[PDB]
Design a protein around this ligand. Structure first.
Ligand SMILES: CCCCCCCCCCCC(=O)OC[C@H](COP(=O)(O)OCC[N+](C)(C)C)OC(=O)CCCCCCCCCCC
Lengths: 64, 119
């Protein structure tokens, strides 16, 4: 009932509730919101593709 | 009321809203941010829409118009270009002829009648 529950249904319910709480904020009808992300994604083409892992690290940071 | 104003489909009983990670009430104190958790659809005829009574375009067909044969404040209430209600405002030429005749003789009251209709 200890670590194998934190690394299991009880622990994964907390993490899922944390992440799904962040995501549900993003789905909201706003033209300006969807406009910035479209423009933001254009930076993927600009950056040298050796810098994908850093953007992945940053994207996790913003989840918090 | 005076300053602002506020069905075919069946009134459907739905209670016990649940998600995959709990109940409706467990996340009730947090779902206002989540626009996809609202329970008030905007197409419902009973949906509370409170809009101020902005008055319709009321052009004054007023005294300073060549069409007017005098001084007529024709208060026209129109939506678009159709005519909804018209309330002419006569009196901008009430000289009080009926009051003056009572103090003048029958011969002296004749010239008042030529000034009723100019033509
Ligand atoms: C590599 C080894 C693989 C072993 C099998 C996989 C791990 C077991 C997880 C079972 C969880 C479960 O069953 O989900 C049940 C749980 C919670 O339970 P509940 O019903 O809400 O009860 C709890 C009621 N409270 C909390 C209100 C008190 O729901 C969840 O958190 C939903 C998300 C599950 C994420 C699954 C991810 C799987 C990743 C696997 C690869 C690492």
């Amino acid at each position: 009932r200890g670590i194998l529950q934190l690394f299991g249904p009880l622990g994964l319910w907390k993490l899922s509730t944390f992440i799904s709480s962040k995501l549900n904020k993003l789905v909201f009808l706003n033209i300006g919101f969807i406009l910035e992300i479209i423009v933001l994604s254009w930076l993927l083409i600009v950056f040298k593709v050796s810098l994908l892992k850093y953007i992945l690290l940053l994207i996790i940071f913003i989840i918090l | 009321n005076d300053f602002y104003d506020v069905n075919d489909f069946f009134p459907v009983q739905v209670d016990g809203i649940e998600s995959s990670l709990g109940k409706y009430e467990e996340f009730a104190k947090d779902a206002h941010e989540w626009e996809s958790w609202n329970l008030q659809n905007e197409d419902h005829p009973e949906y509370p829409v409170k809009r101020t009574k902005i008055r319709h375009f009321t052009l004054n067909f007023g005294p300073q118009h060549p069409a007017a044969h005098g001084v007529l404040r024709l208060i026209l209430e129109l939506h678009g270009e159709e005519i909804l209600r018209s309330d002419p405002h006569v009196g901008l030429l009430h000289r009080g002829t009926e009051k003056l005749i009572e103090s003048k003789t029958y011969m002296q009251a004749l010239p008042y009648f030529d000034r009723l209709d100019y033509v």
